[model samples]
Target: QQIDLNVTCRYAGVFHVEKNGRYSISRTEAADLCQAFNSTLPTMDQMKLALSKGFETCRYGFIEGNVVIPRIHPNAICAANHTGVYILVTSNTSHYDTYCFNASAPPEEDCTSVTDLPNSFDGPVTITIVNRDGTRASKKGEYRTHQEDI
Candidate 1:
């Protein structure tokens, strides 16, 4: 018989994973936040397995097998020139996403397609900040260039 694993994901702080490769969680933060949601950090294999689940394509994240900014189809020129997910070793910080796995139900099949991700932009667009209640409001004005001084 075959066993199973449960996993899930949500885009909030999406990128700028703080404090280096660490979970970016502060002392006052709940490291078990993943567990609290009935999930946990994923290993390289687990991550690969989960990836096969056809999760949303995102930037590099908390995966153990180096960086995971998969250089799939139409892969942007963000980093290396690889053809698949870029495998990055420890060290250096990354502003990527995270994948939380479930230990109850097994991962789903199909939906195994992560769309455009690990992407950077240089154009006019709206930026919003999420509030404590998880509501986002676009910042005043449009950013066609830079906003790093805020």
Candidate 2:
């Protein structure tokens, strides 16, 4: 049984939920990982439904058949220009991202708090909602190599 995280997907795909409760997947890892356990590589469509039942990109995940499905955004530094939406990208040789699936005891909880200050910071301080599904809109923050000083 897979867990239904009751979350919203900015990008859309299954993610490898690592120790910190944040993403830890790559195209290189997704299919193989699932296979080691008895699962098979998800077809692109299954990749969408199987993995991204929710999150964002910074929206391209490997579809096991080795295809980045496709792609958006907000500017907190300024005012909000875009709400969360879906877009598409078609990279045939990029080993960027991937979403995985399992027939495990997939939990029964929703997305733990996504953003919280003194009351809620649902996920780890390092992970945001963007990478939550790999939000392409979450690029600036999600794909950065170093942390910024506020």
Candidate 3:
């Protein structure tokens, strides 16, 4: 027997992902970073929508069409100490954090059900997973059912 079905899922949108130091990303790297996080650089409209929801950061982030620094309140350290959507027309080589748009982005896979697990054996359990870069990997891990008895 075979069955087919279609379904839809919603995801949390627009995240500010960054490198280790936060300012180490160029436009090229910005796109790649978003890819690593399973998202992409947000569009101007998408970014504006996020800003309207009170998303504010002192850091600049790369967005489609241009770079943006959104500020909802006056901060002495950011964006000329003003409150609004600040635009930056700059070169792609400029470094900034990334604002990613995520729609239907998959969640981190974990917590397998007991029904799906392989039958317990003497050896470790073997598992395979897909990496963010589209690579597949297999790992073997030891499963302990009772630790106190040992």
Number of the top TM-score candidate: 3
List, in order, the clash count of every candidate structure: 11, 30, 0
Query: On residues 55-123, what C-alpha lDDT tens digit does candidate 1 reach at each position?
Result: 434345554334465334444454355544456666555444445444544345422222222122333
Candidate 2 lDDT, 1-150, residue by residue in tens: 111111232222243322123343454454543443234444556544533344333434445565443222454432133333222344344334444443332333234332311111122234223234443221111221223311
Q: What is the TM-score of candidate 2?
A: 0.34
Off by over 4 Å in 3: 1-12, 90-93, 105-150
Off by over 4 Å in 1: 1-31, 64-67, 70-74, 77-85, 94-96, 109-150
If the candidates were sorted by their lDDT against the true structure, best first, what order would they fall in? 3, 1, 2
How does each model score on TM-score? 0.42, 0.34, 0.57
Question: Candidate 1, overall lDDT?
Answer: 0.37
Ranking, TM-score, top scorer first: 3, 1, 2
Which parts of model 2 have CA positions greater than 4 angstroms off?
1-13, 16-28, 35-40, 50-52, 69-93, 105-150
